[PDB]
């Protein structure tokens, strides 16, 4: 009799097209719980992200709009794929919930990080993330929250970036929104950010992959900064000058560190057999780690730079890497103020635009 319908998953209610069935719970996006579901029609597994009354809040509104926009506009081998979208409410009046259906992968990095990969594998995955990130940048978008949980794999050894709710263009202009262990200095110390902020994230992931556990823990947001400097050592004065004077003080007050050499943070012991052919060497990986994990954002390698690094570029393929930027409707410029009403309506438009 009706097009949608509902299942209670614990305490949360999913109301979804009869096509989607057998919901299990699986994780959380920036916003929304998320179910795996079988899509009877296309006869394949899918993932579905319930976004509850997003216009409830500038944030939820903003972060939602983003995802919708960015889930449609972006298309790439390495970015998670839009499959379907909808609302069950049949009228702007009535409206509250959005649902995004997207491809479901086999696992996230958690996961892979535990096992002992071999250079080709690491270098490859790396490569993929990067190209993925490259693609987003090529249209100004900075992901901002790259971490094992946002990255997904499949057993055909392929990789996809995911979750766009947090993504935008340069900073500053809320501090504690990006995951602690993955924060670049410029975000820990609130200097604002350029694309290569994502590269920081990358470095921690690669490192974590190798190290077997998180690169810089950090028992709280401030401790985090010790962990970084504990390991990489106190940054130059020339850098401190970039710091806002209030924070600038504290930092200059931190005990000094020399920090370890990369060869010490990442010794051979830690690596697979050095590769069949060259470029793919423990040391080469190290070299690249050492150009990403770099406190000073202005002395830090770019996606493209990384894409060329001997350890990555062995897989380099211009058909993937130099793909057309995702064109973004300038209507939106991802950070202007609005109200509950204008928010609710934007979403609905954008959603109804997408059904």
């Amino acid at each position: 009799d009706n097009n949608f319908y509902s299942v209670e998953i614990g305490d949360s209610t999913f109301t979804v097209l009869k096509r989607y069935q057998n919901l299990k719970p699986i994780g959380s996006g920036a916003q929304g719980i998320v179910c795996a579901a079988y899509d009877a029609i296309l006869e394949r597994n899918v993932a579905i992200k319930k976004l509850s009354r997003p216009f409830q809040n500038q944030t939820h509104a903003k972060r939602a709009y983003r995802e919708l926009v960015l889930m449609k506009v972006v298309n790439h081998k390495n970015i998670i794929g839009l499959l379907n979208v909808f609302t069950p409410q049949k009228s702007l009046e009535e409206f509250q919930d959005v649902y995004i259906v997207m491809e479901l992968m086999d696992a996230n990095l958690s996961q892979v990080i535990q096992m002992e990969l071999d250079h080709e594998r690491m270098s490859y995955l790396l490569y993929q993330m990067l190209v993925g990130i490259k693609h987003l940048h090529s249209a100004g978008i900075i992901h901002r929250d790259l971490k094992p949980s946002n990255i997904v794999v499949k057993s055909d050894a392929t990789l996809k970036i995911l979750d766009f709710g947090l993504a935008r263009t340069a900073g500053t202009s809320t501090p504690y929104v990006v995951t602690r262990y993955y924060r670049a200095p410029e975000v820990i110390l609130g200097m604002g950010y350029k694309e290569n902020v994502d590269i920081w994230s990358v470095g921690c992931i690669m490192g974590e992959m190798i190290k077997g556990g998180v690169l810089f823990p950090g028992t709280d947001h401030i401790d985090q900064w010790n962990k970084v400097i504990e390991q990489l050592g106190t940054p130059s004065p020339e850098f401190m000058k970039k710091l806002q004077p209030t924070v600038r003080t504290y930092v200059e007050n931190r005990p000094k560190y020399a920090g370890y050499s990369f060869e010490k943070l990442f010794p051979d012991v830690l690596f697979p057999a050095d590769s069949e052919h060259n470029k793919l060497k423990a040391s080469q990986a190290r070299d690249l780690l050492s150009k990403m994990l770099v406190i000073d954002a202005s002395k830090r390698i770019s996606v493209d730079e990384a894409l060329q690094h001997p350890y990555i570029n062995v897989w380099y393929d211009p058909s993937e890497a130099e793909a057309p930027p995702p064109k973004i409707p300038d209507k939106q410029l991802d950070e202007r103020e609005h109200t509950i009403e204008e928010w609710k309506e934007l979403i609905y438009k954008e959603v109804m635009d997408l059904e």
Binding site: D106, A107, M115, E120, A157
Partner: peptide
């Protein structure tokens, strides 16, 4: 260096 096609989420 052939791209891989298997990854072991065993």
């Amino acid at each position: 260096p052939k791209r891989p096609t298997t990854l072991n989420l065993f």
